[PDB]
Amino acid sequence: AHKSEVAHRFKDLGEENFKALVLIAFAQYLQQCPFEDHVKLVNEVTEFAKTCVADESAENCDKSLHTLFGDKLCTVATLRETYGEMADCCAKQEPERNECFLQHKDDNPNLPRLVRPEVDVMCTAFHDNEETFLKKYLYEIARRHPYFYAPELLFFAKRYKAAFTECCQAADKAACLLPKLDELRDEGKASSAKQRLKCASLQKFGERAFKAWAVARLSQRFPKAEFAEVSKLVTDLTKVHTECCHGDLLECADDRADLAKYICENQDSISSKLKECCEKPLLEKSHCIAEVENDEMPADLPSLAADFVESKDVCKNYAEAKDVFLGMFLYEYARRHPDYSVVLLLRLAKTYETTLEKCCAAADPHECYAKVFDEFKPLVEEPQNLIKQNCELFEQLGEYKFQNALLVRYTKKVPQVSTPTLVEVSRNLGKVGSKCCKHPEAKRMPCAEDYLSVVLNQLCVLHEKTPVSDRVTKCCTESLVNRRPCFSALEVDETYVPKEFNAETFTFHADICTLSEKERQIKKQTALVELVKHKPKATKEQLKAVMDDFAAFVEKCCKADDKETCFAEEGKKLVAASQAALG
Numbered sequence: 001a002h003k004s005e006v007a008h009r010f011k012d013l014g015e016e017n018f019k020a021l022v023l024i025a026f027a028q029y030l031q032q033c034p035f036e037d038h039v040k041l042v043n044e045v046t047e048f049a050k051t052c053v054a055d056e057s058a059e060n061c062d063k064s065l066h067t068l069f070g071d072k073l074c075t076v077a078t079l080r081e082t083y084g085e086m087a088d089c090c091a092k093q094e095p096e097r098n099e100c101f102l103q104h105k106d107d108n109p110n111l112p113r114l115v116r117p118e119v120d121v122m123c124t125a126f127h128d129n130e131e132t133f134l135k136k137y138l139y140e141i142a143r144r145h146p147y148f149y150a151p152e153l154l155f156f157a158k159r160y161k162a163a164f165t166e167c168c169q170a171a172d173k174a175a176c177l178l179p180k181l182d183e184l185r186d187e188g189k190a191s192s193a194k195q196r197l198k199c200a201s202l203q204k205f206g207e208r209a210f211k212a213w214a215v216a217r218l219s220q221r222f223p224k225a226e227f228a229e230v231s232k233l234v235t236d237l238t239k240v241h242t243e244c245c246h247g248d249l250l251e252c253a254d255d256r257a258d259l260a261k262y263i264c265e266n267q268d269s270i271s272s273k274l275k276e277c278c279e280k281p282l283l284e285k286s287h288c289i290a291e292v293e294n295d296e297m298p299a300d301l302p303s304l305a306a307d308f309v310e311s312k313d314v315c316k317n318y319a320e321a322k323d324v325f326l327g328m329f330l331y332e333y334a335r336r337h338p339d340y341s342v343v344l345l346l347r348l349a350k351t352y353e354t355t356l357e358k359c360c361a362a363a364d365p366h367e368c369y370a371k372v373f374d375e376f377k378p379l380v381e382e383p384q385n386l387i388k389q390n391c392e393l394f395e396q397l398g399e400y401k402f403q404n405a406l407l408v409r410y411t412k413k414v415p416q417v418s419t420p421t422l423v424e425v426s427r428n429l430g431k432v433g434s435k436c437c438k439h440p441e442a443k444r445m446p447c448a449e450d451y452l453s454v455v456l457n458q459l460c461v462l463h464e465k466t467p468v469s470d471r472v473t474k475c476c477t478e479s480l481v482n483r484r485p486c487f488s489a490l491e492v493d494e495t496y497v498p499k500e501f502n503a504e505t506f507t508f509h510a511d512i513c514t515l516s517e518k519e520r521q522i523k524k525q526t527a528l529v530e531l532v533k534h535k536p537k538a539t540k541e542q543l544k545a546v547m548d549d550f551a552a553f554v555e556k557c558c559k560a561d562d563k564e565t566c567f568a569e570e571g572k573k574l575v576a577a578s579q580a581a582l583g
């Protein structure tokens with residue numbers, strides 16, 4: 001270490017890990033360079049590291065990895081005739097140089113769009129050359145998602161490897177592999193969204209706010225930890241996320257490790273759930289810790305009434321350090337309720353703060369704040385209720401028919417939203433319902449928050465680049481804790497004038513009967529949205545008349561001898577019979 005940084009990295013990571021991350025880091029700076037140029041780089045940088053491992057005292061093995069990596073970047077021939085002013089970065093000395101590079105990372109690289117080949121082609125390529133097949137895609141994905149934390153992209157890639165291993169040698173390859181690839185896309189996109197949103201919220205609402213979130217989240221997970229310990233961890237976590245949000249891989253990676261090193265050295269004073277994690281190699285340590293089970297909460301804890309309502313010096317302890325008092329509230333409440341969403345805890349916190357502001361200025365303070373815990377009852381109520389009604393609805397309808405209810409619901413509220421956006425969000429919102437409703441009671445709200453936070457921002461980002469309704473603009477710019485209830489408060493837009501008829505949008509062709517089940521579902525769900533937008537004032541019964549008449553139709557023509565003639569003449573009368581009903 002420090003004698004040869006590059007030799008130390010290599011030893012800690014291993015050759016295989018080393019060459020994987022470097023390909024990632026190279027594909028994340030030079031997004032336009034072809035695969036094989038990157039290969040040649042990764043090969044040159046690894047063989048070099050080897051010499052340093054064998055002989056740390058060698059030629060320039062004492063340089064920082066920041067210098068080595070930069071030197072390699074400015075090797076690339078058409079740096080100027082391809083990446084433009086990025087070549088100018090090479091004239092700058094190292095501290096400034098890397099910053100110049102980060103500033104030229106493109107989230108909109110304007111690359112094409114990865115097509116997923118046939119399972120046959122995939123499994124053949126995978127077998128006939130794993131190395132090239134896998135690293136080509138690692139490269140192809142990393143270049144499209146720069147800023148995506150490199151070691152995280154690596155963990156997904158390893159999960160792609162097992163999937164391709166188990167399934168290519170299966171009876172029905174396609175039926176084993178396709179659902180996994182889809183799950184992996186969804187988790188990976190959800191990963192990058194959660195990273196994106198954390199930096200955005202930090203940039204928008206501030207450090208103190210992030211800290212409030214932190215205390216909440218941490219006390220839930222490490223309830224046996226003392227407040228002084230949770231408080232330091234909150235401070236430490238804020239530092240690593242702040243720095244990790246600057247965008248540089250080595251700064252982030254080293255901060256994450258130190259924090260993993262600390263925690264693991266103090267598990268006794270943190271959680272009894274950190275044993276297997278703290279055994280893992282450096283690459284996996286913080287990744288493991290970040291997803292650790294909740295430690296069980298201390299046997300028998302007193303009510304919060306004593307320290308927060310009854311005590312003789314509430315208003316005093318509050319008056320000294322307000323944020324400290326408010327965080328202790330958070331601490332004591334979060335550790336007791338791992339079944340609460342973090343934002344909900346922040347609302348009870350917000351409410352406790354307000355009443356304290358009013359009530360501590362009273363001639364007899366305890367009088368006016370003695371009932372404050374009675375306002376928490378309806379704030380806790382609202383989320384708890386919403387999962388019951390939604391999970392019930394789902395449990396008796398199944399995922400696909402459950403998304404179709406959301407489809408109609410949200411098209412009726414915000415019909416100005418583009419059709420594919422409505423299909424994408426309503427389908428997504430159904431999956432978090434299929435994910436979290438399978439968890440038991442006390443895990444539902446924390447889970448629903450986790451994926452709602454993703455799907456909600458996803459939609460906000462579209463609407464930011466393309467706004468079409470102000471009540472959505474308002475729900476997206478409202479506070480952190482107000483975001484979701486704002487959306488739940490969306491009402492049916494009955495001032496929306498019906499979209500005009502277009503026989504194309506309701507013309508169905510015989511290709512549907514062969515299309516993949518996912519592919520096929522989008523088609524129908526696209527038409528459903530369009531059915532609502534054309535006739536939003538129709539009843540549940542009117543709607544279900546048409547959705548049934550259509551099911552019959554497709555059943556008939558998809559088993560006909562001449563399927564294309566059937567889809568033409570029968571869809572011709574299907575549309576007419578239906579216009580007539582909703583006329």
Ligand SMILES: COc1cc([C@@H]2c3cc4c(cc3[C@@H](O[C@@H]3O[C@@H]5CO[C@@H](C)O[C@H]5[C@H](O)[C@H]3O)[C@H]3COC(=O)[C@H]23)OCO4)cc(OC)c1O
Nearest residue numbers: 102103107145146147148192195196199200203245246247
């Ligand atoms: C401290 O100031 C800086 C902030 C940043 C950005 C950044 C900036 C943002 C923001 C979000 C982000 C986010 O970008 C990424 O965007 C991608 C958008 O498409 C999805 C698919 O994938 C996203 C990445 O996964 C996400 O991680 C940050 C995470 O890693 C960074 O460093 C990113 O929302 C508000 O403004 C860079 C800097 O370098 C000069 C800074 O100095």
Ligand SMILES: CCCCCCCCCCCCCC(=O)O
Nearest residue numbers: 021022025069253256257283286
């Ligand atoms: C610039 C190319 C070489 C990059 C080598 C460093 C790659 C990440 C180091 C892994 C540290 C992981 C720390 C953690 O997340 O817990």
Ligand SMILES: CCCCCCCCCCCCCC(=O)O
Nearest residue numbers: 341343344383386387390429448
């Ligand atoms: C969107 C389809 C339903 C998904 C499952 C039900 C979600 C109910 C809302 C949960 C809200 C938790 C976040 C919060 O308390 O602010």
Ligand SMILES: CCCCCCCCCCCCCC(=O)O
Nearest residue numbers: 386410414417422425472487488
């Ligand atoms: C604003 C665009 C309309 C399409 C999606 C609407 C999303 C509403 C989010 C509601 C999340 C909680 C579900 C619920 O409150 O029942």
Ligand SMILES: CCCCCCCCCCCCCC(=O)O
Nearest residue numbers: 524527528531547550551575578
């Ligand atoms: C205006 C004429 C429309 C006639 C056809 C409307 C069909 C709307 C989509 C039907 C979706 C059915 C859902 C399903 O069966 O999976």
